[PDB]
């Protein structure tokens, strides 16, 4: 479920942007924790808009 | 304590501001003191002095 956390932590130590491709959990939108995470798929909390 | 019951609120888009705003609103709405909050001003980006000035 949460296998791209080590990469985001180690990279965001230096503020090197990280692009996610298939991870869709809602925790990665919290920019206080994951400082430099972008992704091309919307998370699990836009089905609310639908 | 110092009887400043009328205030405002100026917040940028720095992460973690929605929790601040929500907590302040609920705490104001659940007290007997009677806070007279006037404005909730949120800036969008680095102010151009064009729309944030108003």
Swiss-Prot record, chain A:
Component of N-methyl-D-aspartate (NMDA) receptors (NMDARs) that function as heterotetrameric, ligand-gated cation channels with high calcium permeability and voltage-dependent block by Mg(2+). NMDARs participate in synaptic plasticity for learning and memory formation by contributing to the long-term potentiation (LTP). Channel activation requires binding of the neurotransmitter L-glutamate to the GluN2 subunit, glycine or D-serine binding to the GluN1 subunit, plus membrane depolarization to eliminate channel inhibition by Mg(2+). It comes from Rattus norvegicus. This is Glutamate receptor ionotropic, NMDA 1. NMDA is probably regulated by C-terminal phosphorylation of an isoform of NR1 by PKC. Its phosphorylated state is influenced by the formation of the NMDAR-PPP2CB complex and the NMDAR channel activity. Heterotetramer; the NMDAR subunits are modular and harbor tiered domains that function in concert to regulate opening and closing of the cation-selective ion channel pore. Forms heterotetrameric channels composed of two GluN1/zeta subunits (GRIN1), and two identical GluN2/epsilon subunits (GRIN2A, GRIN2B, GRIN2C or GRIN2D) or GluN3 subunits (GRIN3A or GRIN3B) (in vitro). Can also form heterotetrameric channels that contain at least two GluN1 subunits and at least two different GluN2 subunits (or a combination of one GluN2 and one GluN3 subunits) (in vitro). It is found in: Cell membrane; Postsynaptic cell membrane; Synaptic cell membrane; Postsynaptic density membrane. It comes from the Eukaryota. Detected throughout the brain, in brain cortex, cerebellum, thalamus and olfactory bulb. The chain holds residues 101 to 150 of 938 of the full protein. Belongs to the glutamate-gated ion channel (TC 1.A.10.1) family. NR1/GRIN1 subfamily. A hydrophobic region that gives rise to the prediction of a transmembrane span does not cross the membrane, but is part of a discontinuously helical region that dips into the membrane and is probably part of the pore and of the selectivity filter. Coiled coil: none annotated.
Swiss-Prot record, chain B:
It is found in: Cell projection, Dendritic spine; Cell membrane; Synapse; Postsynaptic cell membrane. It comes from the Eukaryota. Detected in brain cortex, olfactory bulb, hippocampus including the dentate gyrus, striatum, thalamus, superior colliculus, inferior colliculus, midbrain and cerebellum (at protein level). Detected in brain cortex, hypothalamus and cerebellum. Component of N-methyl-D-aspartate (NMDA) receptors (NMDARs) that function as heterotetrameric, ligand-gated cation channels with high calcium permeability and voltage-dependent block by Mg(2+). NMDARs participate in synaptic plasticity for learning and memory formation by contributing to the slow phase of excitatory postsynaptic current, long-term synaptic potentiation, and learning. Belongs to the glutamate-gated ion channel (TC 1.A.10.1) family. NR2A/GRIN2A subfamily. Contains an N-terminal domain, a ligand-binding domain and a transmembrane domain. Agonist binding to the extracellular ligand-binding domains triggers channel gating. A hydrophobic region that gives rise to the prediction of a transmembrane span does not cross the membrane, but is part of a discontinuously helical region that dips into the membrane and is probably part of the pore and of the selectivity filter. Heterotetramer. Forms heterotetrameric channels composed of two GluN1/zeta subunits (GRIN1), and two identical GluN2/epsilon subunits (GRIN2A, GRIN2B, GRIN2C or GRIN2D) or GluN3 subunits (GRIN3A or GRIN3B) (in vitro). Can also form heterotetrameric channels that contain at least two GluN1 subunits and at least two different GluN2 subunits (or a combination of one GluN2 and one GluN3 subunits) (in vitro). In vivo, the subunit composition may depend on the expression levels of the different subunits. Found in a complex with GRIN1, GRIN3A and PPP2CB. Found in a complex with GRIN1 and GRIN3B. This is Glutamate receptor ionotropic, NMDA 2A. It comes from Rattus norvegicus (Rat). The chain holds residues 164 to 217 of 1464 of the full protein.
